[PDB]
Symmetry: C3
Subunit: 242 residues, 3 copies
C-alpha cells in the first residue's frame, strides 16, 4: 500500500466568500528547516504576492521570493550540503481564490509534500501519506472550503468529547470546565503545509519524519488560520459546571 502518493505532471460569483473578515497582510509565512533546526528567519509573504518562490539561490530581498542558498547554519552537515545542492529552482507556492494553495515543482528533483488535503483526496488517513510531486508538476495542495468544512466539523466533534469527559467523571462540591482549547493543536494542523526538497521521508525511506530530512519548509496559511480562530470563538464558553 502506497503510503507514498505519487504526483506526476499532468499537462492541461454564485457563492459568497467564506468570511466577511478582511484579508490578512500576509497570505502565509514560511519557516525553513535543516533537520530539526530552523535556518534563517521566518519569511512572510504579502497577500499582494499571490505567488512566492522558494529556490536555492541567493537574493535576500524578500517579498515574493524566499532564497535559501545564502542562509548560514553552524550545525550544517556534509549531507545537508549535498541535498541543498539539488534544491535549485525550488518551487512556487501560488495562492488562488480566497486562500487556495498550489505548488509548482520547478526543481529538477521531486519535492515531497505533507498535506492534509491530499491525504483526504487519496482516501488516506490524516497524516498517513507523503505526497511526492514530480519535477514540473503543478497540483493543488490546499482548499479553503474543504478545510473550513473539516474545521467546523472537527471543532464540534471535540466540543462534544468535552462535555463527554465532563459528564463522565461527573457527592461533594466540584466544578468542571472544558479545556480552554480542546483539539486546537489538531485544527491548526489543517492550516499548515510542509514540504521537503530533494529527499523524501516515510516507510520507504530512511528519514522517518520530515524532521529527519536535510532541508524542508513549514508553510503557515493565514486566511485559514483567521477562519479557524473565528471558529474557535463561536463555541460555548467554559462556564464552570457544578
Amino acid at each position: 500500500n502506497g503510503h507514498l502518493q505519487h504526483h506526476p505532471p499532468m499537462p492541461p460569483a454564485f457563492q459568497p466568500p467564506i468570511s466577511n473578515h478582511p484579508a490578512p497582510e500576509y497570505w502565509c509565512s514560511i519557516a525553513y528547516f535543516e533537520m530539526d533546526v530552523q535556518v534563517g528567519e521566518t519569511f512572510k509573504v504579502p497577500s499582494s504576492c499571490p505567488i512566492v518562490t522558494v529556490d536555492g539561490y541567493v537574493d535576500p530581498s524578500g517579498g515574493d521570493r524566499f532564497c535559501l542558498g545564502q542562509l548560514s547554519n553552524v550545525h550544517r552537515t556534509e549531507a545537508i550540503e549535498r541535498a541543498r545542492l539539488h534544491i535549485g529552482k525550488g518551487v512556487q507556492l501560488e495562492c488562488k481564490g480566497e486562500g487556495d494553495v498550489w505548488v509548482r515543482c520547478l526543481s529538477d528533483h521531486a519535492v515531497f509534500v505533507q498535506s492534509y488535503y491530499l491525504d483526504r483526496e487519496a482516501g488516506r488517513a490524516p497524516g498517513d501519506a507523503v505526497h511526492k510531486i514530480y519535477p514540473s508538476a503543478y497540483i493543488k495542495v490546499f482548499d479553503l472550503r474543504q478545510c473550513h468544512r473539516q474545521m467546523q466539523q472537527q471543532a464540534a466533534t471535540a466540543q462534544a468529547a468535552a462535555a463527554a469527559q465532563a459528564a463522565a467523571v461527573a457527592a461533594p462540591a466540584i466544578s468542571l470546565s472544558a479545556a480552554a482549547g480542546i483539539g486546537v493543536d489538531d485544527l491548526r494542523r489543517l492550516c499548515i503545509l510542509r514540504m521537503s526538497f530533494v529527499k523524501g521521508w516515510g516507510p520507504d525511506y530512511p528519514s522517518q519524519s520530515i524532521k529527519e530530512t536535510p532541508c524542508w519548509i513549514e508553510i503557515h496559511l493565514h486566511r485559514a488560520l483567521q477562519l479557524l480562530d473565528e471558529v474557535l470563538h463561536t463555541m460555548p464558553i467554559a462556564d464552570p459546571q457544578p
Copy 2:
C-alpha cells in the same frame, strides 16, 4: 519565606525623559521550556494593549496568538499545558511606560516582576507573583524603575574603586517582565526556574530600556 505572592482579584506627573517615544512599547518572546518558539512579537506604541492568548490568528498588531505556533521539540507535557492558556492575558501600558497585567485565562498566571518584589517586600527577584484569573494587577512602574536603574548603576559604578559592580546584564533585567501560563515555578513547585516551565514569555519594555541607555551614557559601567 512566602516565595509565592498571591494576587487575587480585588475590584476598584510629566514625562521622565524628553527622549522620543518608542516605535514599540514592548516586544514579547514566547518560550516552551528553554526553547524560543515563534518570531518575537513587537507591539506598536499605538497599541497600548496587547493580548497574548492560546488561539490561532497569526495577524500582527495587538494580538499575539501562541496556539498556531509549532515546535519540533514540543512534548506531550508542554502540549497538555498549552491546552489551558485560553483567553491568555492582557498586558497594558499606561502613561509613559507603566505596565499592567489582566489575566483572562481560566487558570493562574505566574509573573516575574521586580516592581511587585519591592511591594511584597521580598528580596529583588526572589519571588513569583501568582496572578489569579480576572485579576487586574499593576506590574511595572516606570518612575520607580528609573529611580532604581540610576542608583543601582551609580553604586555599581562607584563599586569600581574596588560583586558590587553590576554590568548592563543586571540593569537590563529591571526593564524586563516574564510570565508563565498555567504552570508556576519555585521551591513549592517541580519547576525550579521559569525556563523549566511548559510555556512562558519574556517581555522587553522599550521605554524603560531607553532610559537605561540614556543612563549608561552618563554613569558608564
Copy 3:
C-alpha cells in the same frame, strides 16, 4: 604563518534597484544565535552595533538587552567589553567599512582583506584595532571574483561529466559551487576575543559574542551571476 592579520589605526555595477536593506546582521554567542536578525535600512548608511540597550532599531543594533537562557559567565564577562562596539558604514553601491569604537579590538573575517593580505581565501583573521577605520568589502572586486569563480565551478562540473554504461543520462547539480560564492558576500566579526592558532578559540563559533553580516547588494549581484549559468541539460 601569519594567520592573524593586524589592522591598527593609521558607475553602477547593476541597474537592479538598491536593496531595501543594505545588510542583515545576526548576533551569536558561541554556536547560538541570540536575538533576532537586525536589518539595516539603506537609508541608514552607518549602523552602530554596541553593547548598550536601546531597542529602537533603525541605525543602531544594541546587544546589551538581548537574552539567552544558554548564556554563561564567560559570555557575560565578554559582553561586558563590547562597549561602543563598532560602526559598519556603507559607501557607494556596496562597499563596507568598519570603525572600531570599542576599547578592545575586533576580529573580522573578510574575503576581501584576505585577497589584499595575499592569503588563502578564508584562511585568515583580521584584527581591527580600536580607532582603526578600514575598508573591509569591495563590490567591484567582489563582483569580479564571483563571475570567475562561478565560471570555474561550471568548467569543473562539465569536466566531471566527461570523467564518466551508455544507456544512461548524467547531469550536474544546480547549486554547484553556490555556497563558497555566497560566502564572498558575507562578513563575520568577533568582539573582544579573536580566534585561530594563536587563540584558545579555534573558530569564530567558539567565541563568546560575534556577528554575521549579510551584504545585500552583493547577494543580488551573485543572484544575477547565477542566473547566467548554462542551464543544466542532462547529456547521455
